[PDB]
A paper describes a structure:
Cytoplasmic dynein is a microtubule motor vital for cellular organization and division. It functions as a ~4 MDa complex containing its cofactor dynactin and a cargo-specific coiled-coil adaptor. The formation of dynein-dynactin-adaptor (DDA) complexes is a key regulatory step in dynein activation. Here, we determine the cryo-electron microscopy structure of dynein-dynactin on microtubules with LIS1 and the lysosomal adaptor JIP3.
In addition, in the DDJ1-560 structure the C-terminal JIP3 residues 374-550, encompassing the LZII and RH2 coiled coils, bind at dynactin’s pointed end, with the intervening disordered residues 186-373 not visible. With JIP31-560, density corresponding to two coiled coils (~12 nm and ~6 nm long) docks against dynactin’s pointed-end subunits Arp11, p25, p27 and p62. Based on the dimensions, we assigned the longer coiled coil to the LZII and the shorter one to the RH2 domain. Connected to LZII is a stretch of density containing a short alpha helix which docks onto p25 at the site where the Spindly motif (LΦXEΦ, where Φ is hydrophobic) binds in other adaptor structures. Upon searching the sequences flanking LZII, we found a JIP3 sequence, LYHEL (residues 382-386), that matches the Spindly motif consensus and explains our cryo-EM density. To support this assignment, we performed gel filtration assays to assess the interaction of JIP3 with a recombinantly-expressed pointed end complex. These showed that whereas JIP31-560 binds the pointed end, mutations in the putative Spindly motif (L382A/Y383A/ E385A) disrupt this interaction. However, the crystal structure of Arf6 bound to the JIP3 paralog, JIP4 (59), suggests Arf6 would sterically hinder LZII’s interaction with the pointed end. We conclude that when JIP3 is on cargos, it binds the pointed end via its Spindly motif whereas the LZII binds Arf6 and is detached from dynactin. Our data suggest LZII detaches from the pointed end upon cargo binding.
Numbering used by the authors:
A (entry chain J): 12 to 390
B (entry chain Y): 2 to 88, 106 to 170, 219 to 376, 388 to 435, 448 to 464
C (entry chain U): 8 to 70, 77 to 182
D (entry chain W): 1 to 179
E (entry chain X): 374 to 467, 518 to 551
F (entry chain x): 410 to 467, 518 to 551
Write the structure that this text describes.
Amino acid sequence: EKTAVVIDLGEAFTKCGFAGETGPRCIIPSVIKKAGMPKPIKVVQYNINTEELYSYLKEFIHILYFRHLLVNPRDRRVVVIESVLCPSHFRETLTRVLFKYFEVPSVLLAPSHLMALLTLGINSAMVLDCGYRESLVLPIYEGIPVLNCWGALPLGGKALHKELETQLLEQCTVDTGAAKEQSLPSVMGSIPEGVLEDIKVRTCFVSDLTRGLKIQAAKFNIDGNTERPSPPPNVDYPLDGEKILHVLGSIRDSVVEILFEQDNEEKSVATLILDSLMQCPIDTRKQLAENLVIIGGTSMLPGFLHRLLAEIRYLVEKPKYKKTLGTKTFRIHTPPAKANCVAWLGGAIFGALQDILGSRSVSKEYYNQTGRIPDWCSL
Amino acid sequence: ASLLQSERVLYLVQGEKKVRAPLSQLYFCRYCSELRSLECVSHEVDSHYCPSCLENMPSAEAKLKKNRCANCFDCPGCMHTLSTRATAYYLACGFCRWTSRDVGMADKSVASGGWQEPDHPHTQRMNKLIEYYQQLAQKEKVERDRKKLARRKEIKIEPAQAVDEVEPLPEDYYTRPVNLTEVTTLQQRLLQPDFQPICASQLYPRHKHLLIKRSLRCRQCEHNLSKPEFNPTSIKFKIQLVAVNYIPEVRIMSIPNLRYMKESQVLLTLTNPVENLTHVTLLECEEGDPDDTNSTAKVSVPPTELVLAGEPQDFPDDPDVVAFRKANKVGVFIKVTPQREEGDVTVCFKLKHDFKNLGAEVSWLTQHVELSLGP
Amino acid sequence: SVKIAPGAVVCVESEIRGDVTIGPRTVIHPKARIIAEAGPIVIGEGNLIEEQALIINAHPDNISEPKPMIIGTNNVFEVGCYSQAMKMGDNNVIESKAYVGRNVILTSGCIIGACCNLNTFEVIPENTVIYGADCLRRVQTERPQPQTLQLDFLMKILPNYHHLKKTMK
Amino acid sequence: MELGELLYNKSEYIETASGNKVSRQSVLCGSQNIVLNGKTIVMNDCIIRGDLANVRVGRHCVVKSRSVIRPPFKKFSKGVAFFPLHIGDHVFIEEDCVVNAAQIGSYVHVGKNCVIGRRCVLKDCCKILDNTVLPPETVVPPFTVFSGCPGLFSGELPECTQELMIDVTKSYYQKFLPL
Amino acid sequence: AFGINTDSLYHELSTAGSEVIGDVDEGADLLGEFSVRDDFFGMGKEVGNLLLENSQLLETKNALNVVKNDLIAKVDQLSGEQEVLRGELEAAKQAQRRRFTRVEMARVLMERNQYKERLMELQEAVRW
Amino acid sequence: RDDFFGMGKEVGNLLLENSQLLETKNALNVVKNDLIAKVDQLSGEQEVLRGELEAAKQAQRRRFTRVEMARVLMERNQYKERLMELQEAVRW
Ligand SMILES: Nc1ncnc2c1ncn2[C@@H]1O[C@H](COP(=O)(O)OP(=O)(O)OP(=O)(O)O)[C@@H](O)[C@H]1O
Ligand SMILES: [Zn+2]
Ligand SMILES: [Zn+2]
Ligand SMILES: [Zn+2]
């Protein structure tokens, strides 16, 4: 029997390759380039019309299946890793291109959270996907995804890119190099997303808890007379050769504080862990809070896990969680891959089990004379 | 191919999806007498060839080598094939001046057999988890067939140990200037997905990816539409069935001005040795979905015979109808009443001809050709 | 005004205008337009000018004042390049179809790559490789590279195919 | 959409015995070594270096205006020379190019204002787009579009380049009428 | 004209003697030509078409080497189907070192071809 | 004298190269005829083993590639000893 193909359609980056390996064969941006378009278009789009998404997904998995994978489509089973509460018409169009166009034997619609848990050998953990769009938490308990205690906030990479564009147009200092070497604020209209994510992954970083609370208090100025700490030095980042943008050092440690902004709703990144934990049953809480895994491509910002653990240990002393989740010990697992590909590594672990992969999946003859994909919703 | 602007003429394919394609990207099936587009036809994989050293290598060897060539390396700076260099041997790039001594590996005394990738460090845990979960999949496998007939050695792995205190941020991130040459961008960071390094001194070069010679199979009758030759640097195919060797093509050379009347000229070219053509259909009356039309063509003609070589030209002259008659190439005047919209003048008209099915030469096909002008 | 030292093969099809001082071992290819406008040009030891290396000293025309150029030792200019630099070091290559703007100082051993239009008021540091038309992207080189053997080949094959420029003693 | 009537001055171009059309302003150094066999076109100020090697082009080759072809240089084991580049048949070199290639294959369109580096090998029926830079010692495959600023692989050509490039360069030779 | 013309460019542009001297070349220095002796020029052209006679034998050798390597792709597929059908009929009836040597030989052959290919281009150069 | 003797050496060297290319062409045409006859008898053996099965139902690679490569090395050899003499016939 030939090996399975494991594909995770992310929002920013699609992770792809063969099952049973120790890493993905490709990580690509999830964009396609048509004829005449000056910008590449994102292939994943929710609540748009059907045939455009079908044509975009047909060109993208044709590029994925004959440029990175080098293998026939009608020979092997596909494990398609999707998020929990992914949109159902997007799942229906993805199964329609993977069954009607490529004509594979069997796709398997796989939640990313349970095969983020699968790479450690454990069966019950708190799981948190810090993706491009959402920051989605879930409890997995003995192989059951606890759907009653989910929690999502739109604090992904897209909010970080919008915040970085807002502070860069607030303090833009470019040097043109055509006798315009002084401060020239916002001579371009909008910074592109690739240069914004390159500034975010090359220059920006995550501050500490005690530094970040003083950064929030100095931004607040509630009787704080210049009580900010020492910022990092300014970084001269280039755009297209001659343009040199001086990124200020306050931006490099203050643009990531919107993940841990309080603003009186108690809705930050670390609060939805405790907000999912307070709806759990009381027999699950100790060895649900003893096993926290953090997946998702935001999670390899430097210092992010230490800031998240210190923010959890600061937020445990609040009186809303002191009576219920007060005396808890919080530990973080180390997954064996990097945090972009934990869900892929468990999907490639699950795709190598060839005895159960034909039975735990949707066959193409079942899609031929039913036409309906299973879901967690009603039928 | 792109020197003539080949997107100006488009042909309507007929299948489940009606797309418009240029004739360079169209294939014609012979068993079903119907041209097929690239988006409505099936694709295969024939062979794997490295683009740097053009040598073929088989499929199980590619599955062993993980779709990577055994000799050629791509640099981490740009995406360019590295070259070996003597002093005793070290790798260096041509576009950027990235050498092998930037990442700190020693020079190998042999040129080809000394460079290899480091292994993944967590492959022992991955193999232990695979050999645990295959045993658990067998223990779940033996119950469902037992349930089906009722209707009709243990290995445990030590799991991962969570830490109560993760490794924090270093204090040298504060109060130290970053170096943009030293840190890596995300595009060359995600070309090493096993370990993604921050610094450029931990970014080892990868091997060269391979490409695919593609075979094409028709989805109605499973026959090869274009099977290439197996040996690379080959131009001849084992079997080709392309539309520019079977169908007649229309081409434009004379575009007049857009003052609401035009008499343009096209040429009909030929692939068959003797054929008949007719542009007499004026794209019906809002039929066949001509939704991209923006003008109105007269295009009235009788059928014209056409002869390729490797009293048909003296008697039926018709200089308002047939402009010129060279070898396998006949010019036809079309009267356009253009510019019904603000811009982008397009003309849809149908084309009837004859083809040999192989009586069998009286198989008549109607081709819906949508051609665009500069407006 | 064309002061050519002996040993240097200069062909006659290269358009050389103005006060230049050609050094001992240089090679000038055909269609090599070196024009001196505001001041003299000094070209040192063995700088192989190859094809359209357009070298212009019109500083005040585009935008006392002698203002010369100094060009050092083994400075090879490739095909279609555009050089305008009042101080230039030794052992350094600029590549094909590159643009160097006016106020660029060059020290030893640096690569200017293909089609990189660089124009800044900046001294180029030691052994920096600028690549790409899109951006600049410096990378350091640990070793200054040599070039002699192509021009010691090129002394012996050029005068039996081309005529030679005049030479003082 | 095919090529129009490009007009040239009758006293400007020299029409040879086999069918070659060379401009007078195209400097070509060392004309005893350059072999131009078929009905080729060398346009105005196209610098051809027939010094240091021999240049042999194919049948219907169009070298456009202000473009430089030259042999490359290779460090030998014993003693150095310049490699004789051999352009194949039906090759469309566009304007303002720099060619330092060795063994350009047949039926290739080479796009406008591009640099091909030293000892770069072009195989048959490939295509290079506009404003690209190829590095030294690169081999491009057949039916391949190479584009981009480091000269990467970009796309795939249609399979009927062989039935099209003959028609393109023969129509370009037959649409070359004097003024 | 004919299919090929190996008359270089000096003998094709020396019909008038002024344009090749002035415009497209320097044209000087090697003004001494070579008497095309009725037999020196003819038996020099006898090498120049026989090298094309060698080149057509080389490309037909490269044509049949496609056919041999395509035939051995279909020998082993019928062999692998023959062994599977033999095992099914039978059930119905009831070296690493060598591979490394092969790899070494392949590398060596590659080196040889690389040297050959070029060296025949330098022998193509010094034929003229 | 010298130029005539020098290129009459080249006529003989190109004549021996044209001889060995035709001998290699004969030696691979013989094995192409052997391969098409062997795949014809294997097709006959496969229809016999299909029909009798239907009636009843009613380091090799190493050695081979190795031989071929030794042959290749031999060929390259009878070439790099000839063209080194051709390359010193450039040198004179
Ligand atoms: N090495 C890295 N360091 C920091 N940030 C990174 C790194 N790699 C990717 N990112 C960022 O992480 C985000 C993408 O995360 P991830 O790959 O998990 O998303 P996805 O799977 O594409 O999306 P989604 O889960 O919403 O479908 C982007 O903002 C990207 O810039
Ligand atoms: Zn390779
Ligand atoms: Zn590089
Ligand atoms: Zn068909």
